[PDB]
Design a protein around this nucleic acid. Sequence first.
RNA 1: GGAAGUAGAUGGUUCAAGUCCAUUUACUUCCACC
RNA 2: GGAAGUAGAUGGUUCAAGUCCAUUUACUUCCACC
Lengths: 430, 430
Amino acid sequence: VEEILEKALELVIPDEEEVRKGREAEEELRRRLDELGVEYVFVGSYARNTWLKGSLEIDVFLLFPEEFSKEELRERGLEIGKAVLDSYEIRYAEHPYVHGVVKGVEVDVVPCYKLKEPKNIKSAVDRTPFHHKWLEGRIKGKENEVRLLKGFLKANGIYGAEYKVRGFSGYLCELLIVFYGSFLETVKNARRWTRRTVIDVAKGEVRKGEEFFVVDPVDEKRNVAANLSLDNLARFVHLCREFMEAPSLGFFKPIEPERLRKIVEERGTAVFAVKFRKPDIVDDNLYPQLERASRKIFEFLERENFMPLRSAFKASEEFCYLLFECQIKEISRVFRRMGPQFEDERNVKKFLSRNRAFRPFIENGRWWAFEMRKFTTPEEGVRSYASTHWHTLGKNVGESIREYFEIISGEKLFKEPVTAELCEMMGVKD
Amino acid sequence: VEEILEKALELVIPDEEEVRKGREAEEELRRRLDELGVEYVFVGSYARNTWLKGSLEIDVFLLFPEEFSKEELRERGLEIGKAVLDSYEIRYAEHPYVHGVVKGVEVDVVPCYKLKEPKNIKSAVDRTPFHHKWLEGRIKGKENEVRLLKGFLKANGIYGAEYKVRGFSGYLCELLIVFYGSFLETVKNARRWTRRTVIDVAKGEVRKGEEFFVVDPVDEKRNVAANLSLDNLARFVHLCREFMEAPSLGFFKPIEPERLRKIVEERGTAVFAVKFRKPDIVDDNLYPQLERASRKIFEFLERENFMPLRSAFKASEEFCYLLFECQIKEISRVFRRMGPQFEDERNVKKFLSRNRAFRPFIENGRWWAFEMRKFTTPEEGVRSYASTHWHTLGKNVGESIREYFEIISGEKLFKEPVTAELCEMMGVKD
RNA sequence: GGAAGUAGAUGGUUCAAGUCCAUUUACUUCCACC
RNA sequence: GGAAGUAGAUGGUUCAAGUCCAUUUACUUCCACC
Ligand SMILES: Nc1ncnc2c1ncn2[C@@H]1O[C@H](COP(=O)(O)CP(=O)(O)OP(=O)(O)O)[C@@H](O)[C@H]1O
Ligand SMILES: Nc1ncnc2c1ncn2[C@@H]1O[C@H](COP(=O)(O)CP(=O)(O)OP(=O)(O)O)[C@@H](O)[C@H]1O
Ligand SMILES: [Mg+2]
Ligand SMILES: [Mg+2]
């Protein structure tokens, strides 16, 4: 293992030229910011030298007096960000900031309140300067351990707390390194994590809770792992077990429509997608909506007895796809409806008063009716469901589905940019 | 209602010529029996004049000393029966008797023990002479009420306690008339019977029990309605409710393969039969076995996710048919198998060590595997099931299935003598 | 023959079976055939 | 935007809904976007 981690360091540590680029970009930022007479602080991974090789982003925090309105922070912050970056983008879900580039390096310029105590925070980002002060004199010397953890997580698709990933944030990685001492110790101990593991770095303690909870040393009410999904927690624990069993440098490194067609026909399942235009909204808004829409349709498919197996979704540049595989390609038109016990004649009368095609029957002490379905395939079902229940499939996703959707299968489906997702959904290997 | 019951009397009461035939057959039996110096007693419906018009059978009971072996009763009883009847058949499940004809009338000649007290009975039939003594001076004058109840039950397929029917015995009908006073009172009160109704004629009482129970005034441990099915009890109660709501003389009176084909295709269901040679055994042995075989296959169909709707069975002269209708004509080859929670690595290791086609996955905190079915249709499934599980489908039925069976559907099935059963199974009306 | 129960022994399946699919011994009832 | 909760109002389905499919008002958190 020790030999592998040596090799892995070459993948996670920035070389002298990349470090040089960062420092020069930092120096230029300070120069631009000092010219404006702005109050700022460097925070995050650049300021701690815990950033992953090839993935540098400098965080500059603009410190505003607590009295300022939320609207002043965005106006003033966006104004400063734009004046200070070579090129810029402004795109966010709630908390305002400017993304840009200085001397080839990515930068976020972020307005925040200058608080004493990261308690009753005023903006969403107010803890961040306190994270830095806390980590400052604790992370020193353990930089490459953090970089190993980040690289391990990134190579396995579970790095980042954003909705798209629902994984481990960079800050969480730093806290784990402070807690365990090193990447290897983190990985060894994570093998024994449960869905009820509470890690409290400030108290130097692991206990049991209602949920997986890593308490922010800056804010004991804050779960740093709040947005780590159960399944992704499960993935990391499993990965840690595998790595220790058979340590591989491959842990640190990240089909033709014809074969996919044959696999689907081998499975004998109904495979299809709902396709609609992607709403022009940020990822952090879009993905939870794609998750909701996918779940609502899945649940419809289950209560309709199509026996859905799994679901998946994918957003391309212009379209979104909700993907489903079902055990039932076609169900009978007739089904049975449960009626009352033979005993209560009031409800039996009412149950039998319905005009039906097929004459109700007594079985095991109760009345039952044959009834007719409006659809017999999972595709016909989803068409009905998505057309009438658009409004429950996410604010923007539901509105887009209301404007246009189509259900795709077969040769037509395997031509869509969804092949990676389909393979993962069906556990296709090789 | 009173007018209908007047008309109905003409259907249930034997005319003077049929009564005359019975009396002459009785006189001839006595003459044949007296010539042999045999000890006998007339019992049952002929002896009480409670027999249904057109359905006369005389019961002659041979009274043997209690000390006699079971084998002497059969040998001696069969010997006497044969000497005394014009023609005869000997066919029974357990308790020996001879069926025959004297002067055009059906007769059962039955050996029984001459007990004091119908307690700790020695043969299955030992209560019968006591039933007669009990009913003798209680049923007098209410003969036609009994005949109305018998006729009502017979016209609706629930007369007789034998396994083929699982309904109301003639003796049960007599007890109900003694309890309620008349057919109309029986029918009025039966509307309020439940699956827990206990009727105790000897005590003049209705109470609540664990099950529907009519206590034999001759034997308080005996449930006269022991073999009345829950569903047939339910049928009678419902029928009683209908009759009182809309009294009809029709209550007392008992499809082309092409239309049936269209109905099945309208339903979109899988309809098929298991066909095998009828074992050469009595009804009372056969029917419970047909019931078992039908249930075992149904249960297989349910746990295999073919969503069976109902089942039915029919014995012809030479074949037996087990009939099934399923919502699922074809299921996918792939299905999901539930594995362990991500937490216990011992069981996860073992779950993942199985060589599979399709790579297991984590969902909601636990491992799942894709697995492949050996069959994809309910017919393929039953073929597999009946070929390997013949031994659990009844002693004789299972052995016959082991020798030969076939699964039939479509045009081929609608040509079998099973159309009545199929219509009833699917609630076909008109 | 079928059903219910009591005690015991097994095979298969399954990550895991007293708990699912089956096999089997002993004992106790009960039902249908009147 | 998404999630959880507290209180209230509705439509549909159903023999029967506080209990299923949905709609909606007020209030309390929480998460992602750093
Ligand atoms: N979801 C979240 N939870 C907790 N803290 C967060 C956070 N997002 C941002 N932060 C804080 O803001 C700092 C900067 O965040 P980012 O720039 O998004 C990532 P980073 O921690 O610098 O590491 P990375 O660039 O190596 O991924 C973090 O170090 C952390 O203090
Ligand atoms: N399953 C059963 N339960 C209770 N008593 C039964 C019985 N089978 C037969 N008996 C007794 O034996 C008598 C003769 O029975 P069966 O001849 O089979 C019918 P029955 O009662 O004479 O009426 P039926 O000929 O109008 O149907 C009955 O009257 C009853 O006393
Ligand atoms: Mg950064
Ligand atoms: Mg008779």
